[PDB]
């Protein structure tokens with residue numbers, strides 16, 4: 001997260017930190033709780049990830065230093081990637097994680113409502129990623145208010161990339177506030193009528209918070225059907 005501020009403990013209940021044990025443990029990507037045993041995130045986060053067994057999910061986290069070898073975590077029973085995914089920059093950068101055990105909701109971990117298809121503004125991108133292109137994972141969960149930018153507006157900034165309707169861009173004309181390396185998979189949460197909705201999944205972008213370079217996110221509303229299909233028994 002570039003140009004943001006440290007969050008408060010429990011400020012973003014759905015946000016979780018995904019770790020990989022190979023070759024050694026470390027933050028891998030962001031993620032959103034959306035059900036007892038369902039974590040939503042970006043598909044590109046599992047490039048070269050063979051077994052779901054190397055994945056460890058931590059919810060209710062504020063600071064990475066809350067995580068040590070003796071720290072509890074939810075095991076990942078299954079990794080479901082969208083059958084059309086290929087490159088994050090081509091779309092379908094969405095994936096589901098089915099946790100080994102059910103999640104007990106508390107003040108520090110609750111799910112986030114999926115946007116209503118009937119809805120095809122007050123948005124924030126959160127994460128523990130870089131503060132600038134070259135940097136390091138942040139200990140304290142970062143957050144930043146970013147305005148959504150139309151696709152026609154996005155396409156222009158990306159004359160080399162084709163921004164479909166399954167994508168949505170957010171950023172500032174001037175930059176300065178955007179997600180960066182390590183925020184991937186993480187949520188773009190927007191609040192309407194004081195109800196949060198998972199509008200986007202951090203996906204890609206040229207650099208971080210650069211002028212006229214909106215961050216490209218997966219447009220979640222375009223996948224709820226896919227989601228209900230995968231979450232179903």
Ligand SMILES: *[C@@](O)(C1NC=CS1)[C@H](CCCNC(=N)N)NC(=O)[C@@H](NC(=O)[C@H](CC(N)=O)NC(=O)N[C@H](C)c1ccc(Br)cc1)C(C)C
Nearest residue numbers: 044088178179180181182183184203204205207208209215
């Ligand atoms: C995620 O946090 C990560 N996914 C995997 C590792 S880190 C970032 C979020 C990017 C948000 N950007 C923004 N709002 N400005 N995603 C990526 O790094 C993805 N790639 C890219 O965003 C860009 C796309 C491009 N056309 O350049 N690629 C890129 O930065 N590539 C270089 C090679 C790179 C440098 C450092 C790191 Br840690 C990764 C890649 C994924 C790689 C698809």
